[PDB]
């Protein structure tokens, strides 16, 4: 299995990019998970409103 280390590094770069992107938008996920915490359901309308 010589093809088990390419996919690991591909997912590693994907995770690194996702972390670097989520760091800048940390407030977005913060207010979003708080909104999910108070209001027990979360649709696309509340989703796009909370994207502000």
């Amino acid at each position: 299995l010589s093809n088990g280390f390419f996919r690991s590094n591909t997912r590693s770069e994907s995770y690194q990019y996702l972390s670097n992107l989520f760091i800048s938008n940390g407030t977005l996920l913060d207010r979003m998970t708080k909104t999910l915490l108070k209001k027990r359901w979360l649709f696309s309308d509340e989703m796009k409103i909370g994207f502000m």
Partner: peptide, 24 residues
């Protein structure tokens, strides 16, 4: 009480009244 019904769809669970036919 405790349920799994979203607050947006609560008002949709009631029956509205209706005006009687005014003309007769």
């Amino acid at each position: 009480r405790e349920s799994t019904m979203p607050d947006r769809f609560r008002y949709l669970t009631k029956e509205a009244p209706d005006s009687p036919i005014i003309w007769p």
